[PDB]
Paper text:
Two homologous tankyrases, TNKS1/ARTD5/PARP5a and TNKS2/ARTD6/PARP5b, catalyze a post-translational modification, poly-ADP-ribosylation, of target proteins. Tankyrases are enzymes (EC 2.4.2.30), which belong to a family of proteins known as human Diphtheria toxin-like ADP-ribosyltransferases. Tankyrases control β-catenin phosphorylation through regulation of the stability of destruction complex by ADP-ribosylating Axin and therefore inhibition of tankyrases offers an attractive strategy for treating cancers with increased Wnt-signaling. Tankyrase inhibitors interact with the NAD+ binding groove of the catalytic domain and they bind either to the nicotinamide subsite, the adenosine subsite or span across both sites.
In particular, increasing the size of the para-substituent improved the potency in compounds 29, 30, and 31, all characterized by an additional ring, as well as in compounds 32, 33, and 34, having a branched side chain. This increase in potency is caused by the hydrophobic interactions between the para-substituent and the side chain of Phe1035, Tyr1050 and Ile1075. The most potent compounds were those characterized by a substitution in the para-position of the C-ring. Structural analyses revealed that the para-substituent improves the potency through hydrophobic interactions with Pro1034 and Phe1035 residues in the binding pocket of TNKS2.
Author numbering:
A (entry chain I): 1115 to 1161
B (entry chain A): 952 to 1112
The structure:
Amino acid sequence: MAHSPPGHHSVTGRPSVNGLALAEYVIYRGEQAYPEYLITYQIMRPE
Amino acid sequence: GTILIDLSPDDKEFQSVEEEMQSTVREHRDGGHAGGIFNRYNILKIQKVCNKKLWERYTHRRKEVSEENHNHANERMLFHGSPFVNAIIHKGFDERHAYIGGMFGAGIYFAENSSKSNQYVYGIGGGTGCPVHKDRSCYICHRQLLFCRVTLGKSFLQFSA
Ligand SMILES: O=c1[nH]c(-c2ccc(N3CCCCC3)cc2)nc2ccccc12
Ligand SMILES: [Zn+2]
């Protein structure tokens, strides 16, 4: 893995074009996330 | 050391996780190429992931980050989709789970939009889709996402397309 930018612990990807998109985030240390919930699902075919 | 505890659909905890999953679906600029064509999910199961060693590893790092950032971990709940979700729940996140070719460099990626993480369930760009039907828009096969506690600390803001 790469390093976080100096003086930072993560990167936030802010959308600058698609007004409806929410943010995405990047961490560079596996210890900075805990997998709290496992969700099992299907995508649904639109009617 | 991981155990999985089923949540009842009557549990407020199940319901708040389902609502975050459903309410953060959006349309994608690929028209559904990577993740499939859908507006909502059929939630089949929500399990709590319990591993004391992995939790202590998380909270140890969280304290380090908080102490470097005026006692503020900047903790979020975020989605992660990956073909290696089974490995993650047993062994934790590490460099093997990084997206080397990601827009913000080789790190581990998380999304506010559940549908963004859904694009990665079968690999980068949806890979070749589900293992059984080779369909990135498969409506039959069971998919899995993680809803994760993530420490951001001081986060570098990247404005991007
Ligand atoms: O949930 C996400 N997963 C992934 C993701 C990307 C790549 C991978 N791998 C796992 C290790 C093998 C090579 C690629 C696993 C997960 N990328 C995202 C990018 C943006 C927003 C969300 C995600
Ligand atoms: Zn399938």
